[model samples]
Target: SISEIDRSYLLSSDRLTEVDGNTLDVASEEQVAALKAQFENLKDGDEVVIPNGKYANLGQVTITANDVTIRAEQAGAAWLTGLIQFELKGDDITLDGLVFTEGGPNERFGAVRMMGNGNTLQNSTFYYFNHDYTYEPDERRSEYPKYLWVSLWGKDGKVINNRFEGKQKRGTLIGVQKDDTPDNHLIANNIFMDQKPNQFNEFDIKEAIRYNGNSWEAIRIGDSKSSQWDSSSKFVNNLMIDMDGERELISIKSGDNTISGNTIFQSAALISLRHGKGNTVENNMILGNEKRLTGGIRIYDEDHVIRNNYIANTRGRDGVIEGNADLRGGIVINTGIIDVANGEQLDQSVKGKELNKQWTPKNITIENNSLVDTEWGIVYGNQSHRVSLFNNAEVEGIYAGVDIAFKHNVVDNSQTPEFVSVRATHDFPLVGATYTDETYVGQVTDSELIESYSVELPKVTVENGLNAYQGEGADVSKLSVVTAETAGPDYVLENTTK
Candidate 1:
């Protein structure tokens, strides 16, 4: 059934897509503009089927009618070209079985931009959404163009089984800005693969880390008003990767979302949900052992269940595996205990003068998570004996205290030293499951304590926890971090380019 926003302009009396509606056929580049004109007049349940044809950039296209459907049924054969954006401001709109390509690097338009309620893009392929930047060695790519295929807004937008690939030193593949604020979004069953950085400029790995391309993000959604976040969204069973050091995977700020059952790897960070609330990061396999590789997830909120996840072969601290990008681990819990509202554990913060606090993360469940041979076995607050030792069978070993117990409210993994005081959850000696006798502030305890593993810590090496690509790795606990000097001149594209 169509939603409330449906004006019944394109739907039946019951607010449903009853019949096949009207069919506006776009078979050539010349028919695109006319079909769009036809789109503006489409009455209930109408469809625009664009067959195997290469259409010209129809400038900026938009759908303001409700219950309109656009289906481009072929793979590479069915495609739209030069169209800056296919904007949707209507309700219950859908774009399926289409191919979106040829983005004008000058304007901010690539494929379709969804702003309508209940918008969906299924079985679509967004390829080569490139910029028109000059290929000069020192050319600065403009940030004005919409290098992204889909910039979403409104509510309940979904992207399923799409292919977005092979961009270098350019725009983001997909992004949701701070003001878009669309809720209950689901992005699943997609293949997001990135190629290497183009030789746009030459820099040692040192500067490359900072001066890297604007190939911006694999997927980053921000500014959904953190305080008012509800818990109905999820990113599940998708494939997000850069193969090496092409781009970062996911960095979401929306609260109450679940990031699970996916395979994300080959870049710096897999997921960065900093200071979010009431989320779950589980059953996902995040692999990256590159020089710029950070671990699987970075959760800064107060409550989450980062359990049963397989994260190995990734390095962290902003991919500073051996140096300094100054970030933290794959699973970073920067926020401790939240302040509840009314009665529930609500995680809220002020956004544009409004208090968006529906839920705060007051519980911490880091259970059954297997930490492989990456950086810090599991970086908890200020690094300590609450979990400073490891013993397995006869081959037991103790960390030389990768202590950094001098920081707070910010990043300082177990391996780095801090400049602030630590917070304690329980009293005295901090022993048993919580081993602590140190002098500085310890990692903030979960709700009441920074509990240590009832779970086993498997050291991932290049030989073990390294997963197989295509299926996203098979190993459980082993991958190495390659350095610039050791990774060689073209280490990023060496054998990983597709």
Candidate 2:
């Protein structure tokens, strides 16, 4: 019988045929052989259930058959331990209702690697499945451990109704690889929490710190190597809490992806549009809870639409981390390096894996958002010292000017410094940025960057806790915020009747 929570997502569960298998309690090498035989014997549209037991030291299980469901007898009953890996090589497959715990040494790809199209891994739990030892580098492995918990490489995959927590390693929680074709994957209705910093990096444990390690993202859509291609992925309705892993909780590096209806709470990370273009970020709730490093959206590319988000209590105050306040704010739009226009050809050196360019954001629209009790409501021209020309020395006033639009956003009782600030500092003469006409304000410098437009504090009252919106052009029903009853794996267990 299908669980009640499955009714929310599955179209039909009428043709499932449950078959029994013997318990697995032997050595890992033999256990993997048995598991491979069981899957190889399955036909299409078959459901095989492993008996409820604890199986230790489970190695990889390769599923090459199509349209099959491999499940445990009951949810959370079959405990699979050690370097447990599942390689899904066939289409329309499902692995449900098992627990993966106590991971061994780190693997290269991940614990679960999907290689086929239209597959799913659902109703599962991954707890402390990361390596425990500190990372050591050698000649063969000059870099630290860069393993992920779940890696998606195929098209049209789904990771739903799952729980991923207690990861304290040197990699991301979930990563999606990009190729020539679009993935069109779905990551929804999942709970991601309790992600600590990377123990592999050297940092003090005594102080309240937010490490800026390069890896350790909660979810990354695509890598920088092939970021220009369209992924067409949807990351929706997920809950992220207590995330202290890296600076970017959710990193979007691909184009044409939808990041909507997610909730982030008490995390010292932000959702960053670091690369690519034409991404939509809407209807997310970022509650900072007065955390020192809690941040909101970071825009770095062009042609992105950000609307209908609710952000509150972000204390990205100065001196929290030394010389890092320019990266803070409720919403920070970074100054770019290249003034490349849309649909324009880039220099040959700026393309591919070698020289990934930092493009000046153009034609970005930020609208209909609500920011409450924040330090800086919205920021434009957030310049960092790390950016420079391709090979030249780091110089000042190098931020390329851009054109953007801010419309009908609400900021209530926030903006300790200013509602919207422009911080592009330079010594040389350059082109200035501009917003929409009749809405632009005066320029801070003598470059006449200011046009007829200025940032206006719209008068709209947000309700308590930002639970509901009553402003113009706002839809209260469409905003999805994760709560105790709406996310995580407890819904299935709560509805099960023995």
Candidate 3:
């Protein structure tokens, strides 16, 4: 009945008329006008159902209504395609039970942008959402285009129980936009998998010596400009697998965030605190299974805590450079360029240059972590340590840590020939620190292996049939919350429903 409405009337009038009561379609501009007309008529706490169909060419849709739900009539039955963009501008909006697939590269607006407060995107699926884009490493333009999958703005947004897979082009999966007030976003129980690295051109290949993971990240919170803001976001219980795009699986550019209870499997990545301070990484699992490029955690800021993490068989390596294996360890502590005080805002104009005022890591706490069968554990200073306390410091090519506390850490390197609890060029020294209850065992220390074993994989089972297991150290306990079963989305609609 709604489809039979006069098309001439909709075209003749400047005012949009509602053709349907609840069903929303996105095949054309007239249908979008009708959808907007219906949305204007909805009250608070109403649900807009999108029936099962292949709705193509969904250019852009913006919802300004508050406390409303836009969901599919049947879960995962509605396939929405094209260069789609959903702008949730109202508060307390929820988008659930939908599938967004086969989309183009909407470089300007991105796929989904949550701008209102208390918005939730749950139980949805994004597959091949970005089209392939060609760009040289020397240039900034992309032929196909590059954009974010989900960008969070406003405050108190939640992204839960979603599946993002098969992204070939270079882009971030989710980005939490910065605000003056803390966004306090929650990104949990999602699966980011099967992302390929960008294709480099002849000029890119000639100019580039090694491929560094940039742009293509699973989750990037804030940026260099907003690094000092108190985002206080939570990235918890997510599963990242086969993320070949970059080395930073989750990049924390903001301060005061929490990354816990997640699982990184064969992703060749680590949780990098690239900037800011006061972040916490706890109770996570990184099972590399002797993957050459796998890594754990890398620190750069101050007042951060890394504890209760289980990192096993992470044979960290530099994939591109020959004879550069075992470069990345279980935990890498880096030296900084400038002594920027905690909560100090950086000068934006000069911060973009190479090594221009990189924050020195100080006052960090690494406690109660279990590194089992790793090539190197607790790497202090990825580069040479400096001599002076401030900018007057010179590179001394010595192992020096700023101010870190290594307490209750267990390193078991029985399965590897070249390994150590603390990797350093000289005696590992901390400028301001405390160390207690550190257990160093295994072949590196000429001791037997601690009690560690393997287990079967769960959810998206491993293609190579590798064991995704946890280990119990001699003095430390394994992660209790992080598991293959609990880390990712609850229901995979592509495998089950679709």
Candidate 4:
């Protein structure tokens, strides 16, 4: 599902893609340290043209050189501050349009340590790499430095677009190296934000000390030995905003990945497959558009396909990333270690496990989603398995797995077409649309809650047409009613009075 990832070696030069040799004009940081001592007589395809001021201390550095391309004359005029850490080591490297300014916070890896395979950190513009609570909250300074602006083990890598403007928050923008197995790394778009426009002041957010978990999170895939995971990675259309914590702002815990058309807002747990096998979180827009949201979407998987998403506001509740409630969930499906509803915080917040766990929810396909006023809509932990809910549409629904039965679900109304997600992605996604409207509707088995539909609330409004459920209309004329063009709460079905 190509959202772009050949990058033709940044135009491989032979002019085809451009960039074919020596230009090394780095200005400052001692000419970026004599271009790191001319990186051992640079060959393959040198470029390193970084000008436009300020290249601070830059602490430790390393590139090992090979097919170099450290670009910068513009995009942001080369500005690398006192960056604590750095390493790359050979291979086909490139760090385009650079501008990294940081001179504080770091009691950890700090940033950059790719072992250089096919490196590429596109159109860069990162600063202080997150984590900077403006200083002294009695040094409680909000969770001691554990940042990560690239600790990747560099395989077929490429972190495109690049414009992480995290005001000053901590860690995680890409550090997928745990046992590194996901061979197709490609984090597209890259627009992590502090958005702009007056951009600050809430007492200056305690110096950017509170939001979601507070800063840096775009990718933190697998890192434990849950069977040496981390398979096919791919994060597209990225635009995550104001990093907030309890982590997992696109932190899927590994396995055939593909997080499509991203647009996560507020951020607390916009993406967290916690543990995976076959992942695919499609057509995203969590906290759709007007995002002031903080959290949504979490899964502990099997063969996931959380489709056509459009989840809304989960406002990552204040207090060290929630606790006084607001576990802001829109899809917290924790299948194993049951009795779920955030099962003991998903069994002490699972990070890869395999104990009595009792897992089962295989081939899970929660399709065509569209949630609004959300906090909990699909937090089912199972009383059944091989789950398949069709045309999902939730309006602040399901925090608990309502007495089971939801195989072909759809009581309608949340912004329908079954569940508002105007398809078309990948070619553009898992590339597997996997739907099942199968049209019929007399008693499309197993989908209880409309408050257990014993009948009565099927308030259809094509002018007193078929207010079924409870009164169970006479086949309601074969039933098929998939409305859209969104305008909410007209409450269920029919080409929705267009």
Worst 10 residues of 4 by lDDT: 489-498
Q: In model 1, where do residues sit more than 4 Å from their true spots?
A: 1-29, 105-110, 133-147, 169-172, 177-182, 195-215, 224-228, 243-248, 289-292, 320-328, 334-363, 381-498
lDDT of candidate 2 over 418-439, digit per residue (tens): 4333333353222434433222
What TM-score quantifies how close candidate 2 is to the native fold? 0.79
Clashes of each: 42, 6, 0, 18
lDDT of 4 at 417: 25
Which is the better candidate, 3 or 4, if ranked by TM-score?
3
Clashes counted in candidate 3 amount to 0
Q: Which residue pairs show collisions in model 2? A: 439-453, 439-454, 440-453, 440-454, 441-453, 441-454
Candidate topping TM-score:
2
* TM-score against native, each model: 0.62, 0.79, 0.77, 0.30
Full ranking by lDDT = 2, 3, 4, 1
lDDT of each: 0.47, 0.64, 0.64, 0.47
Candidate 4 regions exceeding 4 Å error are 1-25, 28-30, 34-75, 79-162, 165-172, 175-190, 193-217, 221-249, 252-270, 273-296, 299-332, 337-417, 420-445, 449-498
RMSD of each: 14.7, 7.4, 11.6, 20.9
RMSD of 2: 7.4
Estimate the lDDT of model 4.
0.47
Between candidates 1 and 2, the lDDT winner:
2
The TM-score of predicted model 1 comes to: 0.62
Q: Best to worst by TM-score, what's the order?
A: 2, 3, 1, 4
Better of 1 and 3 by lDDT: 3
